[PDB]
């Protein structure tokens, strides 16, 4: 996160840390969607241009965490992965279209003050909340500019109108992605950056007091550049896919 801030304790309790075991490595963020399922970006698991294709036994997941260094005893939980599921239509060459993946934990995780799943949108959440100018919140332990924070960073960013997202880059934008960030003159700044992929873009519905993951940090071009916008995987678009794999293989 660039131009973000230290999160408050328990502010993002569906936040999940995705790890490479050996050599140890903070790979990406992710999100807790039930006691046995984690959402993340596919490019965190699978990216053939860097000969990156992780197996469940390569990775480890950390939940409930606040500070990136310290083990937090009786606070954080570790999990192993049973299976990874990448979207069959995920495109690693052209534009990270459908950059989404699901991870099934080996054991379920007990919830706590610090470990709590976020909701997914349905048609009405998408209808009501996906509007230019409306802000969501992004969270991660990735780059502060294009070192690395000690504490989870948080920033609020407005959804940007689609033509503006299209125009601002040469990568072929897609219906399964949206972009968010401040326009050059709007004063305010901020963006996700590398190491933040998989983290969630949440929005608090003003109708129930509930948080919804509308996006997944996916890509950008540098971080926090003027006229550049962070890109996020469109969660609701891919809702039916999420429900099927959970239902069928849960």
């Amino acid at each position: 996160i660039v131009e973000g801030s230290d999160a408050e304790i328990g502010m993002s309790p569906w936040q999940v840390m995705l790890f490479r075991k050996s050599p140890q490595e903070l790979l990406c963020g992710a999100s807790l969607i039930s006691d046995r399922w984690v959402l993340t970006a596919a490019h965190c698991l699978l990216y053939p241009p860097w000969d990156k294709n992780f197996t469940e036994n390569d990775l480890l997941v950390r939940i409930g965490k606040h500070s990136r260094t310290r083990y937090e005893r009786n606070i954080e939980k570790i999990s192993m992965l049973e299976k990874i599921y990448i979207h069959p239509r995920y495109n690693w060459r052209e534009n990270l279209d459908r950059d989404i993946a699901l991870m099934k934990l080996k054991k379920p995780v007990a919830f706590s003050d610090y470990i709590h799943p976020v909701c997914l949108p349905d048609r009405e959440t998408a209808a009501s909340l996906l509007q230019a100018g409306y802000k969501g919140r992004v969270t991660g332990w990735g780059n502060l500019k294009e070192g690395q924070p000690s504490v989870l960073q948080v920033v609020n960013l407005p959804i940007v109108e689609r033509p503006v997202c299209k125009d601002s880059t040469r990568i072929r934008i897609t219906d399964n992605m949206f972009c968010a960030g401040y326009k050059p003159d709007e004063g305010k700044r901020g963006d996700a950056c590398e190491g933040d992929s998989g983290g969630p873009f949440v929005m608090k519905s003003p109708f129930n007091n509930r948080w919804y993951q509308m996006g997944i940090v996916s890509w950008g071009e540098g971080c926090d550049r003027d006229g550049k916008y962070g890109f996020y995987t469109h969660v609701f678009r891919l809702k039916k896919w999420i429900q099927k794999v959970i239902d069928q293989f849960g």
Binding site: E8, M11, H116, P206, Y212
Partner: peptide, 27 residues
């Protein structure tokens, strides 16, 4: 079922520092 309601916040009628900004952007 209980999704999106944070123990340290919604559950105990507390706001975090900047959630109001989000609300205001919906206006």
């Amino acid at each position: 079922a209980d999704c999106g309601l944070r123990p340290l916040f919604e559950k105990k009628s507390l706001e975090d520092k900047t959630e109001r900004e989000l609300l205001e952007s919906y206006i």
